[PDB]
Design an enzyme around this catalytic site. Structure first.
Site, PDB file in Angstrom:
ATOM      1  N   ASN A  36       0.821  -1.199   0.000  1.00  0.00           N
ATOM      2  CA  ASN A  36       0.000   0.000   0.000  1.00  0.00           C
ATOM      3  C   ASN A  36       0.859   1.254   0.000  1.00  0.00           C
ATOM      4  OD1 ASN A  36      -2.568   1.204   0.181  1.00  0.00           O
ATOM      5  ND2 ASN A  36      -2.273   1.571   2.406  1.00  0.00           N
ATOM      6  N   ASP A 106       6.134  -4.346   2.465  1.00  0.00           N
ATOM      7  CA  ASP A 106       4.864  -3.842   3.043  1.00  0.00           C
ATOM      8  C   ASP A 106       3.803  -4.923   2.968  1.00  0.00           C
ATOM      9  OD1 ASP A 106       2.204  -1.984   2.429  1.00  0.00           O
ATOM     10  OD2 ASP A 106       3.560  -0.798   3.609  1.00  0.00           O
ATOM     11  N   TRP A 107       2.576  -4.684   2.525  1.00  0.00           N
ATOM     12  CA  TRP A 107       1.592  -5.777   2.461  1.00  0.00           C
ATOM     13  C   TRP A 107       1.943  -6.832   1.454  1.00  0.00           C
ATOM     14  CZ3 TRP A 107      -1.453  -7.028   5.943  1.00  0.00           C
ATOM     15  CH2 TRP A 107      -1.883  -6.087   6.884  1.00  0.00           C
ATOM     16  N   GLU A 130      11.259  -3.620   4.588  1.00  0.00           N
ATOM     17  CA  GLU A 130      10.161  -2.808   5.170  1.00  0.00           C
ATOM     18  C   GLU A 130       8.862  -3.576   5.190  1.00  0.00           C
ATOM     19  OE1 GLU A 130       9.665   0.395   6.582  1.00  0.00           O
ATOM     20  OE2 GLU A 130      11.671  -0.189   7.297  1.00  0.00           O
ATOM     21  N   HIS A 270      10.287   4.252   4.438  1.00  0.00           N
ATOM     22  CA  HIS A 270       9.487   3.090   4.107  1.00  0.00           C
ATOM     23  C   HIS A 270       9.532   2.720   2.624  1.00  0.00           C
ATOM     24  CE1 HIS A 270       6.595   0.002   4.711  1.00  0.00           C
ATOM     25  NE2 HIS A 270       5.768   0.511   3.828  1.00  0.00           N
TER      26      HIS A 270
HETATM   27 CL    CL Z   1      -1.113   0.176   5.268  1.00  0.00          CL
END
Ligand code: CL
Ligand code: MG
Ligand code: MG
Ligand code: MG
EC number: 3.8.1.5
Length: 294
Positions: A36, A106-107, A130, A270
């Site tokens: 995201n 991330d996701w 990350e 990030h």
């Molecule tokens: Cl998120």
């Protein structure tokens, strides 16, 4: 560090929706998965570093990038389980075989870590950065953004994200060290230009992060892949960042205990792909070279 996308977008029909992806080259896959509020575009300056080492694949998650939106949409839509349903089906459709190298952020790391746990014989290596490596507490969350992410999880999130688009317009450039050009920011804005449910993926995602025990389903999923990764003999590459954002503090200490792991550190917060793509790309190519000796 350029603005042009990588490769040609391709499309596969999944469950009635068209999903978009990049699939360049030939050989065993090197599968890059964004989170995201990004898309396959995140990897555009990194994937070229692996040219000739395999099939270079980057999928757009449902509702993101150039993949179709779900309709109806609302607070129940675009949860982790639903993303995993669509992405499992796309990855099946791509006929990946049994020597997949995952490259996750991330996701994309929560989805990819869980897929690898469920398909462990098919995963040749995992490169991650990350990442959501385990359930966390708020104290683990970066201080700079703890209040805003609490607010996304509250009923404030519909105005902040669906009306004001703050995850795209503020969190994303604020967690990149360098300023983006208008074309780069436009490529990230493009899937989420429209107010309302078109932006729902970027609000549903922060509501899925496993923090202080909720939501319980995603906590259980991350608990499972954490315990599995910490004992898995699969080769790993940990791309650490300075300062970093998410993979810092105790989570970073946890990831450093994982077996069969090499590590590099690059500059970034990030969305480190926008600050240090060539260093990240060079580390991934070297990892794949070692796993696929010529
Ligand atoms: Cl998120
Ligand atoms: Mg070409
Ligand atoms: Mg259609
Ligand atoms: Mg008000």
């Amino acid at each position: 560090l350029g603005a042009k996308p990588f490769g040609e977008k391709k499309f596969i029909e999944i469950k009635g929706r068209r999903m978009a992806y990049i699939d360049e080259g030939t050989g065993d896959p090197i599968l890059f998965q964004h989170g995201n509020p990004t898309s396959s575009y995140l990897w555009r300056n990194i994937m070229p570093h692996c040219a000739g080492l395999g099939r270079l694949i980057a999928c757009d998650l449902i509702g993101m990038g150039d993949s179709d939106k779900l309709d109806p949409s609302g607070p129940e839509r675009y949860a982790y389980a639903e993303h995993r349903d669509y992405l499992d089906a796309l990855w099946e459709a791509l006929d990946l075989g049994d020597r997949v190298v995952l490259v996750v952020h991330d996701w994309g790391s929560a989805l990819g870590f869980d897929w690898a746990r469920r398909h462990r014989e098919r995963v040749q290596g995992i490169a991650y950065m990350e990442a959501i490596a385990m359930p966390i507490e708020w104290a683990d969350f970066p201080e700079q953004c703890r209040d805003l992410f609490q607010a996304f999880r509250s009923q404030a999130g519909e105005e902040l994200v669906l009306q004001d688009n703050v995850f795209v317009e503020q969190v994303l450039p604020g967690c990149i060290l360098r300023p983006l050009s208008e074309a780069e920011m436009a490529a990230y804005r493009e899937p989420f230009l429209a107010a309302g449910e078109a932006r729902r993926p970027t609000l549903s995602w922060p509501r899925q992060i496993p923090i202080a025990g909720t939501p319980a389903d995603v906590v259980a999923i991350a608990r499972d892949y954490a315990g599995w990764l910490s004992e898995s003999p699969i080769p790993k590459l940990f791309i650490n960042a300075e300062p970093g954002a998410l993979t810092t503090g105790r989570m970073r200490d946890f990831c450093r205990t994982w077996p069969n792991q090499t590590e590099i550190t690059v500059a970034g917060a990030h969305f480190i792909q926008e600050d240090s793509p060539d260093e990240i790309g060079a580390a991934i190519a070297a990892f794949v070279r070692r796993l696929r000796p010529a």
